[PDB]
Symmetry: C5
Subunit: 314 residues, 5 copies
């Protein structure tokens, strides 16, 4: 798609609007009062670059925003901070997770945004500016950021739940319903997990640096807030390695239960084999073409001395 | 459930009682002599909060209290220190373990405790006030805290004896009783450990902050005592990471137990097969429609050269 | 094969030529305008040596440039810098990759380049110096070096893509086309990943030092540049480890698949073994040769045959 | 069990004796000449207490003494040094290793020793005193400590050797005598290493600590020696870690053996199965009720051409 | 055996000699001109003590000279430095490696050297003194120490090349020549690796600590070469670790090869049975004693509808 979404606001009031013309939003640069410019759809290179040239942001940053498959990171410029955030979808049952790159610039009184597509995790931060919630009005553009980063960070929690279900609904199938496609899912989880912690790890660094560095973030006013988040991020980081670990032995768990049935199937063939092997034989030999019930008795006799010998095993 | 349970005391005497009226205890904030306030059950949020207000507690600390799914932690504020802890109960046999969150706060001369549910490990501290044991009465709130939390440290230990025991039993089945349920209980263990590891490592970090920082805690007076506790902490970690190291390898032990029983059954079947396969054959060619013991005379001959050839094996 | 190759340029004009005469390039040591000396074929050590002696390069380095089993490293000197890269060629199907050692020294207004064999990645750089593009003409010796280095980095993505395929394919043979030769590949894969990440880890460290360190570098202005490829570098030293971690546990997934299959092979062998062993038997003991309703047998054989069938509806 | 063992000694003469009375060995605190007062059997708290006071040793230490599940640690007070240490014994055969805690306090002119039971590694130390060997007579209680120390650590090498062999031996069984028990002993080994490493790892730090700190221990005189015990402490550790590494994969090594044998019992059956399965058929089909050697020849042709097949595998 | 080989060189001239008398090489302590003394054969504990005291060396050192099972290390003193080093020798084909302890003390104009036996890698160094190659003649005692340390390190490369060959040749066996004794050599490799790894990691720390200290190591003249050897040290470490990683897997790689093969002996088996089981049955059922081709064709029909069915698999 394409769109652009600004949310200027102040302690007293706010205004909001949705345009598709880039020149209607550029004068907010010089707002005294905080703004949030959301640019859905980065695919329009010309929109980005325009915004990118007007604000005074280096080309390589602008090019960064158009490169999609990245680490999450921060970089501190003279008048602006630059951040690179991911934000996941997980379809359940078709066990597959998606990741949309967001990019963010903190200058003057504006929090720039760059979303690949429509549909996003900041529909709570939106409401808090519209209906005068929390301390979101009272404060500045760097708090706005902390609003935006938080809203995203919280999202993971609920993804972290969703998989926590997937694990639980796999260390069952493993040890009770041993099956072909169970193996698939298992690796499918193990993989996705990797992709997760490949993002969350730098994500803690991002927040770890933001907290502990500070330039045009108003210091002893927004930094604990950021720290609160930084705490949130540690938790999760932890919580991935956690699952990672549990999922790893998991495949050997299947293995062990798989083999254990092979065994059972073996015995079955062995005892049925082991008894009707010799009984067919004596039946076969008295087919030699060259007292009747007494052979049947020592058939029965020797048949059941196998039967009480597999009680001593099997 | 729900209760309150104070135990005031000084060098000389002591008092203690119980209620379900928050307003009776509040006055104990202005005690010149120590006080242990035990608000068990934290579902009754108005009580928590009533207090949370009266004593000067900031609402985020108070929310913390309410959320029981937390990183065990410690926050220092101006007139008070704040701590969270976990508390475990392992059901033997079901192989299942449960987590209460214990919240705490030191302030001036008072120890605000917050439990989810009746039932705790603080009895042995209760008695040391009750019958005047040790040097509890001659020392202050911080000490009470130490005490209280040392009383916790000590709990994990039995929990580490109990689990050990579960290791012992499991490392019998694995090698001697190859079975389905054994697989289950093993992983079950793995899981539990993780959760323990997860709790203890941070828990550790807590005592480390306390020890080497100390703000309203009679400094060169208690710090050591916290050191001693800070140590047990460590100990437990070791023990923990020990067991981790052990269990992990366990499954691979059992895996090997069973692939070693497959090899048996294969010899049962193989040799059975291997002697009645050619003997039921050659008395098959004499059941065609086109000396007699000379037949049996070579049927024994080979019958035996087989059982000699598996003495070179088996 | 051997080949010297120089490209001299500045804002206005440029020149280029391919030589097999070493002395027809040395005088570029005293160029006011940038110069990119590419010496393909480091077997002709005498050539290398001469470039050295002339420029005033310390033997150690010189020798290192010949020594092609080496860790990618930066060493900074008085007037020059020294850098050593590796450049990779993955062959697909035969899952087998080869790495060239390229070596670089910036100095005055020269970027000395020593390859091992004709054949590289840099071509698009040569386009940008030839057909006046980007901002490479405007910038000097150093920017170039970045451009050169960037060039290579970029190639690694390419390989990563190709590699990335080599996994997706291989996790359909793992759990659907189980076989011998799948195994082989899996090792080859892992080995190669090993050799690879082995080269990146320091590689990162090369671009890292360069940025936060700096000696004779058109720093202000280009530091950011050195930094932007150093970004890419971490990116890929991560994305490597992603594969290590995935592929590591790959031989276990396969395990789980294979036994599951064997198990099936047992099932069929048994539910046959178990039903036609006895029915062969009772149809065996009626081949006795002593003196003593025939469809009753076929019936009671029908009956007890079917209870076997229905009993493997409680398993199998 | 309970005793006390005094070993006063100077350059000129020495005296020693044994006793079940705590008061006899007190006056020595005031010895101008170094002494070694050994306390065996600290199941007598009452006595451990008594001196605890007398020598002016802070009760926390006295507790840490009487609690025998602890980390090797080092703590330097004003008038004293204090050190906890373990002392391992391997029962060969009953793969199982026991520990006894020895705590130590250097003060004035007396090394204090605290053991759980009679039976220690210190013997050698005594001799050198008894019969004036080395320089130990010429030097003070600090040295006495170092020696008592060096003694014990060295005893770990002895302990290594014993472990080395267990290994040598087990890495035969595995690849030469595949069996149910062999496993057991593997595991056992792996347990005994971990508990070892466990004590060694800290211990190392107990020797690292001493060396780089030095308060009362006549310094550039005794430092170099203590370092030597230290150097050894490191050597020990490394060694331990080598084995862990070796022994981890051992069972993998073992699995690869058993599973490999299965391979052969399968083939075995297969060929006997495969060559007779169709030969008992084709005979079996001529016992129908409705060129005799031509078939046997075919059977001789078609028993021959399975063979040729297996000269391309097996 | 036993030998002493001293070399006393100066920018103008040199002299060298072999003598098994330990009094003739003692004047060289007081040489203005650099000296390199090589003791070969450290079984003679009379000559390490004689030369150990003459130079003034501490015993603890002269004992560690002797202790040839040691972690390579560097220790510094007043008038001399100490360095314990190993040198490896690998038996190809027998897949076995044996070491030797070379100990080294830099003092005045004398590098004392302590070799267990004759046979060593310093033949090239002796070349660069004898014929006046390079710049060792013009340089002093510490350049020698370097030139020495370097030859030894360059040693490990020719070693690493041998091992590479082994891995290569082994990893041909795992995946194509599966067997019993293959799996042994694996383990062999691992051990040796792990012996190698254990030695190298500190040798690194040696040239790490030689390089960033320098007292009677002529500073900005030779510390640019200690660096160079230090570099090759890192390389070797790196390269070595390479292997640990590769090999650790290999074992697993073998097991997948075997456990595939069992399957291909399963298929074989099942199918012959599959077909010659129901067919061996009906022949039986017309071997009962109470339109002929008709069955022969329906045998044809069913025997081959199996055939078909296994082209869907197999
Ligand atoms: Cs980029
Ligand atoms: Cs918050
Ligand atoms: Cs890709
Ligand atoms: Cs592709
Ligand atoms: Cs204790
Ligand atoms: Cs036991
Ligand atoms: Cs050996
Ligand atoms: Cs020593
Ligand atoms: Cs018949
Ligand atoms: Na594994």
């Amino acid at each position: 798609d394409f769109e652009i979404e600004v949310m200027n606001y102040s302690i007293e009031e706010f205004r909001e609007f949705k345009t598709t013309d880039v020149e209607s939003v550029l004068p907010f640069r010089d707002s005294s009062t905080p703004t949030w410019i959301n640019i859905t759809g980065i695919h329009r290179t010309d929109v980005v670059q325009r915004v990118g040239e007007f604000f005074g942001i280096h080309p390589l940053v602008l090019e960064d925003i158009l490169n999609v498959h990245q680490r999450p990171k921060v970089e501190f410029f003279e008048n602006y901070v630059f951040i690179v955030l991911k934000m996941f979808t997980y379809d359940k049952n078709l066990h597959e997770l998606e990741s949309e790159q967001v990019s963010l610039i903190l200058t003057k009184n504006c929090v720039l945004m760059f979303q690949e597509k429509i549909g996003d995790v900041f529909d709570p931060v939106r409401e808090r500016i519209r209906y005068n919630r929390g301390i979101i009005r009272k404060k500045r553009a760097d708090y706005l950021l902390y609003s935006l980063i938080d809203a995203l960070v919280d999202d993971y929690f609920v993804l972290l739940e969703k998989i926590d279900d997937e694990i639980d609904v796999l260390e069952e199938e493993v040890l009770e319903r041993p099956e072909k496609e169970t193996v698939q899912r298992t690796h499918q989880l193990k993989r996705n997990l990797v992709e997760l912690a490949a993002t969350i790890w730098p994500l803690r660094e991002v927040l770890s640096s933001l907290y502990r560095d500070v330039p045009p973030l108003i210091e002893k006013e927004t930094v604990p807030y950021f720290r609160d988040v930084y705490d949130h991020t540690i938790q999760i980081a932890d919580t991935v390695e956690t699952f990672r670990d549990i999922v790893s032995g998991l495949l050997d768990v299947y293995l062990s239960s798989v083999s254990n049935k092979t065994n059972e199937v073996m015995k079955v063939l062995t005892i049925i084999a082991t008894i009707f092997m010799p009984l067919t034989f004596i039946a076969g030999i008295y087919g030699m073409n060259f007292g009747y019930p007494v052979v049947l008795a020592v058939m029965g006799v020797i048949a059941v001395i196998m039967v009480v010998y597999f009680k001593k095993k099997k």
